[PDB]
Amino acid sequence: FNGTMMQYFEWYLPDDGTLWTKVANEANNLSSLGITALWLPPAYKGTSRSDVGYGVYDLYDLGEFNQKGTVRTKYGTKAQYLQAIQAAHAAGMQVYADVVFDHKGGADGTEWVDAVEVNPSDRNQEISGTYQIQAWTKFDFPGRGNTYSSFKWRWYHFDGVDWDESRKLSRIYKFRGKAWDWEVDTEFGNYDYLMYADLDMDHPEVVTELKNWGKWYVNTTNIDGFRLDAVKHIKFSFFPDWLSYVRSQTGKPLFTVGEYWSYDINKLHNYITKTDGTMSLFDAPLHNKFYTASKSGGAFDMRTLMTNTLMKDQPTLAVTFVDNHDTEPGQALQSWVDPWFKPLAYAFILTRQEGYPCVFYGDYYGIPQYNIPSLKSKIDPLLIARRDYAYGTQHDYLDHSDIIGWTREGGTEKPGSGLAALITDGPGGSKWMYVGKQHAGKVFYDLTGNRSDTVTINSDGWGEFKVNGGSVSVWVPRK
Template identity: 50%
Template structure:
């Protein structure tokens, strides 16, 4: 009855030294020991240069094997180091999920000429001019790789938009104009149509593009033996393509191939609509819960903790929800900055790691730190991971009955001695709450494991205990 935990093993500011794959290989046993069961790794293929985090994708087939964009290695290492790292994780019973960026390409090899028109960034369906000829960076020949693994070469007609006209040195959103070409449907309707995000936008309606991306998905899965993918920027991608892509990979690589998508939106109805469109074939990160926790951390005791799970994916579709506190996009200095304040972060992690529902994901920056700084949360995360494995089992009973103090209990299961827990979270003053942990725990003495409280709680004959929490803290009580 192992409780799965994912770790995002990177942050935005890692050094450009090619060391991450080696570091992760050496860290595999440690991750297993603390209870991590899967690792989400950054894009492992060649970007615009070695400094690229991976989202400026140049060549999906170059995993650090070819001399392209100034080096053989990627920011994180070579292909051989990638393979060895995955083998080490698998030897420790840890799954590996690759970050897959299929929305756009960057760092083209040569300029091409095509017809395009500028569109309104706030409404991409509104042209700002008539189509005219531009010079765009859309030619991808991959001279360092040649035709190894794939002979597909990219040209302007494989894209739906780009961001720069070399002829007049102007930036903007240029919609490429050609017979039968249009922005994709099945994308988010923000800005009219949110097909275009950045760089040269891949046309996911083009049959040759679809065929090569499916080929890549199957190839990279077999080549590296990854267990799943994190799909980047899916709100900007034709949902029909995403569904077909995963079906193709699972048909060749096994129905258990895991996928979680990044649909960054704070609207549960939009998320539910997307899941229906892809026939519930993918998990999603619970961005709605992230923003609830962000607001809780910003508003302190003015936030009603009873609402923290309202309109979240984990409350509507718990089997499809990947819960997280922060990630590389929400961390300080990122484009979607919305990080959870340090005072509330232990409570946020206690919530996602100890509750019955959801697939929790830990952020590298919260565990190891960002920009070379040590994280203040490593110790509490390790304690919570330990409690998750030993104690976070059995029926959950919620006590979301006070605006500043909420909690829940897990009754534990007979086959795991010592299991069961009580969690209290406060965003105001010290609090207490009587909660039931099950009559099977009658007579037991429970202690608080974070160090915030020193009392002992004796469970009465009906399974009740009076549990305590310090103001602005989380308290985790276990047998």
């Protein structure tokens, strides 16, 4: 069985505290379609009840303590979260928990700190003299007390902040005596700083505490791996060290995927080198390819669709996806793949042998905030393709600027498997492709239902497969 991840949230979910309940309720249904892992949103207390979770306040509050004006998180209570994870496990699915280590917001109090303004466009360039600011850096967690952890956060655990409370100024403030961490991404000179209070990953108390929390969190929740937020903004050598610790101390392999958001493939290869292949990365450049192709009116050269992507260059470390909560309309990385192209992108990541694909909750269930209907009826037949048919040796036909395809011969121990896929960003047509001599004489049909004709395999193992305009067909053998 192929591995298939699902990102189990989107940005515009209502703040109604039901998501963990939905996970428990939907787990069996999802697993039956071949989903094997769920990436859950940050599950700990944010700056308010409605925070999506990246505005992390208290890593140890899983919707259990009366903090930031609520007990539950946006998603539910600690008990509902633990129950969600158990339900996924009963359905035979693994759970990857979102980990937010870049910054910390909603401090309980301020501290007076000598600081300097740096340029948002070049954080290596100081643009003021030293002056004293009132920074939101004091974290005491009075709702939790010392349950689980007695560790308190102060100014010196952070490299800087984005707000002076005394003069009410928005600036990127670097604390005097602190430096931006290295290595990090070099966009804007040094991209360590992102929002709220930025963690100083060179501080030993910070490193020890996050290790402490990592081990506690795995043991407490029974999760199976991690989605790491904002890794280009976090010292590169920190995560290999952290993961080695948490993996050894818990005795779990803890699959981990990092969000290194860049469309520059060489930046991703750099990160993977600097982290010794300890984690996979989201294939952001392939997301860009799908976005671009969807908007190009047929003019995109489909022969290039996976050129300079992680799916091509480093397939065992790629988590492939069509869209996520940041690429949704109105969001920070907005780059939304139009619905006409979306099933083709889904077929590309679901039926090919390269990479670990990830289905987006917002695509699957729809996004009511923008009146975006569910694509479940177009995605399900592709999940079935992956679950039952996408096995064995692949042959590639990325050989025409509209119509591209590939085949899977089927696996010697998954009887009935085998497929031939075609997608086109332009007019439809046909393509001869090799599915395997062993399929000579078999009749193949289009599992998507987009086409009603059939394709019979010739005595050499070749079939003349077909696809409609602007569409996808996934041809599989009759039983």
